[PDB]
């Protein structure tokens, strides 16, 4: 019978910007939780709050029963805040209080990056010099990179790391293969990437 | 949280039974079990009140059998494993029927066959001089293949101790195969150092890959190697070359 609908199903954010997540439900509920689950798939309780406000840190909620909807508010965001948001309900009609998740927003938070120098580079194995992977790296965070149509290359998503002492962030996928034909001025030819992305000679 | 649950990892071939184990919170009087499958929002498997079972999901079969015999710990055995078991299987308590507290889950894959079990191999490839050269900045890859199940950590070492800054690993395996049942995974991890750090030859950086695998009581008739939980390893010395 409760149902539960969470809006927006998507969301993109850049680093620092503000966003409403909304959860609405189709009947009273005695209990409802927001929870974040991380990129790994773990599951963090944010908030209980079948009613009222609550705050914490940059998040806060607020619950309006009587018009059954919650609303998860983020502020100031940063790139660990990306993952799926759950809300989850019980019934007032059953007194076991299972919760009944919704299908989640998910976040994607990209990464300010100070000055992008997109580039390709190549890596040799510290063992030996007969193995390799491209590494394109230092691209703006809206730089989207797709898997390759050679089923012998495999390309990874791409993952900002934050150099924090340096106050420095950057954007990075691999891409490598089994094929002694692999080369890096080839391997990310499925991804639109910067007209002046830097692909050194040697 | 206060909620745990044993084990964290689990690997079983199917047509077996598995038995995982949720310790709520002390004088929580309320406790559930939900699944979450790859990619969703969990789903109520049941609940009890002190000892009594009060509420199973209609979905599922007469082979998930859960107990909590005392009121305190549950124990929720799957018999007949499938395949479509695979999921994280998470446990919650409650006082008295209000707020939740989640444990920390058992991950449990499902195989056609313990021979389909296999380590990572795990290497580090060095920074390019093309990159020292034009950011004065240095990166290391790790990669790490041709494993299964996708149970792994990758943690970075510099000079023996675990760092974060600097690092990041791709937030999920991809498959080597991925229209292969059972496919073997890969997962990479960058860590970038200032050029100056790398070229110096007294520091060492270690890519270390702790894989969940077979257990001591699993059988193994294959004549490879028995693939038990292990940490793989691959590391580099700087250099100013």
């Known amino acids: 019978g409760i149902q539960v609908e969470q809006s927006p199903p998507d969301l993109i954010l850049q680093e620092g910007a503000n966003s409403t997540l909304r959860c609405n439900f189709s009947?009273?509920?005695?209990?409802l939780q927001w929870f974040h689950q991380n990129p790994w798939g773990q599951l963090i309780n944010l908030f209980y709050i079948p009613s009222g406000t609550k705050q914490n840190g940059r998040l806060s909620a607020t619950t309006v029963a009587t018009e059954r909807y919650s609303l998860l508010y983020i502020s100031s965001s940063q790139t660990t805040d990306s993952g799926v948001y759950f809300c989850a309900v019980d019934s007032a009609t059953s007194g076991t209080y299972k919760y009944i998740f919704g299908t989640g927003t998910r976040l994607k938070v990209l990464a300010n990056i100070q000055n992008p120098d997109p580039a390709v580079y190549q890596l040799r194995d510290s063992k030996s010099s007969d193995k390799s992977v491209c590494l394109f790296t230092d691209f703006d965070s809206q730089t989207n990179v797709s898997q390759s149509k050679d089923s012998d290359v495999y390309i990874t998503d791409k993952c900002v790391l934050d150099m924090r002492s340096m106050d420095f962030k950057s954007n990075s996928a691999v891409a490598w293969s089994n094929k002694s034909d692999f080369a890096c001025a080839n391997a990310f030819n499925n991804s639109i990437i910067p007209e002046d992305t830097f692909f050194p000679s040697p | 949280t206060g909620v745990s649950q044993n084990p964290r990892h689990k690997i079983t071939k199917r047509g077996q039974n598995v038995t995982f184990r949720c310790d709520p919170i002390s004088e929580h009087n309320r406790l559930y079990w939900y699944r979450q499958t790859l990619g969703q929002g969990p789903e109520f498997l049941t609940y009890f009140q002190n000892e009594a079972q009060l509420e199973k999901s209609r979905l599922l079969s007469d082979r998930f059998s859960a107990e909590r015999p005392k009121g305190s710990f549950s124990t929720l055995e799957i018999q007949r494993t499938e395949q479509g078991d695979s999921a994280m299987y998470l446990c919650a308590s409650s006082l008295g029927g209000y707020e939740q507290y989640f444990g920390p889950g058992t991950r449990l894959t499902v195989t056609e066959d313990l021979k389909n079990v296999f380590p990572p191999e795990v290497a580090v490839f060095v920074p390019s001089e093309a990159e020292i050269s034009h950011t004065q900045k240095a990166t290391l890859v790790c990669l790490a293949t041709g494993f299964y199940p996708d149970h792994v950590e990758l943690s970075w070492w510099v000079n023996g101790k675990e760092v974060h800054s600097g690092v990041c690993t791709d937030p999920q395996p991809l498959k080597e195969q991925p229209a292969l049942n059972d496919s073997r995974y890969a997962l990479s991890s960058r860590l970038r150092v200032s050029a100056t750090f790398w070229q110096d030859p007294r520091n060492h950086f270690r890519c270390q890959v702790q894989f969940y695998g077979l257990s001591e009581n699993d059988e193994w008739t294959q004549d490879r190697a028995k693939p038990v939980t292990q940490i793989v390893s691959a590391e580099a010395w700087g250099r100013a070359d």
């Open positions: 009947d009273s509920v005695n209990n």
